[PDB]
Each structure stands twice: as structure tokens, then as C-alpha cells.
């Protein structure tokens, strides 16, 4: 299995469970250069809020978009953006990535900024 | 060698069909494996018995990339 | 050049088709191209004799239906399980 | 609805349970018995199940 098909397999179980639970998930996507965060509604097809390093307002304050400091910036931003829209309780979907390093920097910052999970 | 044996029948099968209104907890199908899978508001017991987790109507569907059979329960 | 005389069928299904064959006729069908399929009925002895010449299965035939001429080719054929008889024919519009 | 007349034309003896039950639903009690019923698909459906032993007049 190639890296990607392998990760999607790694992600399927947790997503079905969250789907079953009807949870609003904070979905993360990581790349060597960029990291992305999306709060998606239980229907699985609507993005309520989002943040990432490909948007200039965020990458502008960052040294390198593909590291842990950046991950902390993205996480903090989704949280804020999300809280301002009344969104508070979500579930973390690490999307087949280890709960670690960058993903965990993003998660920790998102919690820091009041997002509940 | 000699034949002459069999076991008691286990009465597996569908207990509530499409459209039937059931109370939560009601067994919808007894099966040996997951011929049918648990969908929304339906649970899977240790012998793969599918049961209602909510009051409502039984609903059979076919879903996903493997064309699998799912039983769910619709509020009525 | 084969010339087959046909009438359009007034019925369809198993009952009607067996009644045709008890009456020394047999059903057939014409399909292909833009027009709708045309269900027809044929004289058995006349087409039996015709199709005993290889030319039938490789030449452009003409079916005449209500004094209209349809140019076709034989496409498939169902024969009786064990008698020298025809049960049905597909023609494709040529 | 519109009214039709239904007459039983053969015996019920020896018939399938479901047919007896269908005669009962029509209210036919015996050979020759004529009954006035409404012309609904539900009624036509019972006539149809036992059509071999009833005659309809419209």
C-alpha cells in the first residue's frame, strides 16, 4: 500500500465511529509544506470553518509553513474562527496521521483557544 | 461412518421487516455473520443480532462501495 | 434476393407466440438504428425453405410489411429443440 | 360505488381456503345466490380470485 491509501485505511474506522456518533469533527490534513484544519458538519459535506497555511493572512506571520509553530497557528485560528460561530464541542479526526508532533501541536493550540474536545 | 445426526434449528432470520414499527431494543434480524450491518439507530450484538436502539420504523438499505446491506431505524 | 412477407404482431408474450406456431406461423423481431423495434409474424414453411440456403444468413434480405420494404440481415435464430422448425428470428436493420 | 351483481356459479366444496375466504368476503352463501356489491377495485379483486366460479352482471 502506498503512503496515502495506507493513511486513508488508517482513518476509516475513527471516521465511521464519529459518523455514527453524529459528532462535529475538526478534521486535520498534513503535508510536508502545509497543514490544514476543517470543522465539518455531521453530514460530512459542509465545512463550517477552516484554516490553513495556504492562506496568506496566516502564512505571513510564519517562518516555515510546514512545521510545528505553524501547526500551532492553524489550530489556534480554527478554534477562534469556530468559537465566533458558536461552535464549541467537536471531535478530533487525526485523519490517519499519528496523534503527534504537528497534528498534536494543532490539537493542543485548538484546545488552548477554547475549543472543546 | 454412520450418518443420522443433525442439530436443533436456531430460528435465525428477519424478525421485523421493512416499515414495521418497533420499540427500542427489539431484535430485527438474527444472523450468524453480518449479512446485514447495523446502520443508524441499530446496534450489533455479540452473535451479530441486529437490534433497535430507538423507537421507529425498520429500514433496509444498500450502501457504500461494497454494496453492503444495512438495517437502520427511522423515526416515524 | 430474398423477399419475406410479414405482418405486424397484434399481441405479445408466451400465449400469443405459441398460438402463432400452432397456426404454422412464427414470431420474429426487427431492430437496429433509429426506429423502434417492429414485432412481426412470419409464414413458417416459406421462411424454413429460404433459410436452407446459406445465402439467407449472409445477404441483405427484404421484409415486406404493409407494402413497405425493410432492408435487413438475419442476426440470430432460435430453432426448435429437435424438429426441423424455427421458433423465432432476430433481424437487424441493414 | 356503482353497483354490480355477483352470482355464485359452482360449489365451494373442495376449494382452496383462500377462495372460501374470498367467497365469504363477497357474502355469497350458495350456488345461484346473487349479491349486490359496489364496483371497487377491492371488490373486483375478490371476483378475480374466484372468477372461475362467479358471474358478474354490470
Amino acid at each position: 500500500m502506498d503512503k496515502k491509501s495506507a493513511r486513508i485505511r488508517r482513518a476509516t474506522r475513527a471516521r465511521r465511529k464519529l459518523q455514527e456518533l453524529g459528532a462535529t469533527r475538526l478534521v486535520v490534513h498534513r503535508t510536508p509544506r502545509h497543514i490544514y484544519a476543517q470543522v465539518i458538519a455531521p453530514n460530512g459535506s459542509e465545512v463550517l470553518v477552516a484554516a490553513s497555511t495556504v492562506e496568506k493572512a496566516i502564512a505571513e506571520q510564519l517562518k516555515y509553513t510546514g512545521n510545528k509553530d505553524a501547526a500551532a497557528a492553524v489550530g489556534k485560528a480554527v478554534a477562534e474562527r469556530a468559537l465566533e460561530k458558536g461552535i464549541k464541542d467537536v471531535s478530533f479526526d487525526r485523519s490517519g496521521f499519528q496523534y503527534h508532533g504537528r497534528v498534536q501541536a494543532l490539537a493542543d493550540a485548538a484546545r488552548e483557544a477554547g475549543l472543546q474536545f | 461412518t454412520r450418518n443420522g445426526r443433525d442439530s436443533e434449528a436456531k430460528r435465525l432470520g428477519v424478525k421485523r421487516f421493512g416499515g414495521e414499527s418497533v420499540l427500542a431494543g427489539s431484535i430485527i434480524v438474527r444472523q450468524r455473520g453480518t449479512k446485514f450491518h447495523a446502520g443508524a439507530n441499530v446496534g450489533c450484538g455479540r452473535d451479530h443480532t441486529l437490534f433497535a436502539k430507538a423507537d421507529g420504523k425498520v429500514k433496509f438499505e444498500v450502501k457504500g462501495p461494497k454494496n453492503r446491506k444495512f438495517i437502520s431505524i427511522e423515526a416515524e | 434476393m430474398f423477399t419475406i412477407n410479414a405482418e405486424v404482431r397484434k399481441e405479445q408474450g408466451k400465449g400469443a407466440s405459441r398460438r402463432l406456431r400452432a397456426a404454422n406461423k412464427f414470431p420474429a423481431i426487427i431492430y437496429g438504428g433509429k426506429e423502434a423495434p417492429l414485432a412481426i409474424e412470419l409464414d413458417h414453411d416459406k421462411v424454413m425453405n429460404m433459410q436452407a440456403k446459406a445465402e439467407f444468413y449472409s445477404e441483405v434480405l427484404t421484409i415486406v410489411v404493409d407494402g413497405k420494404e425493410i432492408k435487413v440481415k438475419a442476426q440470430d435464430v432460435q430453432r426448435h429443440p429437435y424438429k426441423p422448425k424455427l421458433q423465432h428470428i432476430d433481424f437487424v436493420r441493414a | 360505488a356503482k353497483t354490480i351483481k355477483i352470482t355464485q356459479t359452482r360449489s365451494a366444496i373442495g376449494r382452496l381456503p383462500k377462495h372460501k375466504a374470498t367467497l365469504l368476503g363477497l357474502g355469497l352463501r350458495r350456488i345461484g345466490h346473487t349479491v349486490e356489491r359496489e364496483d371497487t377495485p377491492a371488490i373486483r379483486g375478490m371476483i378475480n380470485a374466484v372468477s372461475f366460479m362467479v358471474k358478474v352482471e354490470e
Binding site: - | N3 | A54, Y57, S58, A74, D76, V77, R79, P81, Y82 | -
Partner: protein
């Protein structure tokens, strides 16, 4: 004499023999011998008939056997009562439905094939008829 080399199971329900045949065209040879009646062909019958047609052509040309006796038939011997287990397999039959091409042949003149198939048919317990290849 034809027989399955091995089978999943030794014995078989009697079953029934309804329907028309599959494999009703001459698909390998030039001529065929076709069943017109319904019934069972035993392996010995199939063999007796194969011999006859093969004498008849002096082992010239080529012969195909479209049927295969894959149904085991059991019997209970004399002086045994009913029950006490299903009988023992004694022989093998093919189930025949109207329309089955039984044997095919080619590499010989039609006249000789008809003769050979005539000799063979006299060995069989079901009426048959002579058939030919057909374009389509």
C-alpha cells in the same frame, strides 16, 4: 467407460429430469446425433454406441461425445429390506432432455455418418435424430 474420476460426494438424490436440453447445436463436428426423447443414458450405453459408430467409420474422421455420465445411481440388492441406509453406487448415468446433441462427427461423408449414427442409435434407450451443422 466414462465415469467421474473423483467427486465431492458419493451419492446423489434421485432428483427429476424436467426441461429441454442445453447444447442443441452441432458445435464441433459436421454432423450430430440428437436426443428427441427424455431419459437416462448409462455409461455402458454410451460406450456401446461409441463403439458402433466407430466401427462403422473404420476409425476414420473424428468423434465427439457431448454427454458425460456424472450422476451416480445406487441400488439395493436382493433380500435386503427397505431402509438401513442408502444403497451402494453401482453405475453412472447422464440425464438426457429433448434436444441434446449426444455425439458429433466429422471427416467423413454424410452418408457414412448417417449409417454410423444409425448403428449407434440402436444401442440407446431414447429416440434420436440426425442433425447437421448450421451457419448461425
Amino acid at each position: 467407460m466414462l465415469q467421474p474420476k473423483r467427486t465431492k460426494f458419493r451419492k446423489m438424490h434421485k432428483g427429476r429430469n424436467r426441461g429441454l436440453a442445453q447444447g442443441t447445436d452441432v458445435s464441433f463436428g459436421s454432423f450430430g446425433l440428437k436426443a428427441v426423447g427424455r431419459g437416462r443414458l448409462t455409461a455402458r450405453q454410451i460406450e456401446a454406441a461409441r463403439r458402433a459408430m466407430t466401427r462403422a467409420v473404420k476409425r476414420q474422421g473424428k468423434i465427439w461425445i457431448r454427454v458425460f455420465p456424472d450422476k451416480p445411481i445406487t441400488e439395493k440388492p436382493l433380500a435386503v429390506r427397505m431402509g438401513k441406509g442408502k444403497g451402494n453406487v453401482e453405475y453412472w448415468v447422464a440425464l438426457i432432455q429433448p434436444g441434446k446433441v449426444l455425439y458429433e462427427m466429422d471427416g467423413v461423408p454424410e452418408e457414412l455418418a448417417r449409417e454410423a449414427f444409425k448403428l449407434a442409435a440402436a444401442k440407446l434407450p431414447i429416440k434420436t435424430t440426425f442433425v447437421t451443422k448450421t451457419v448461425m
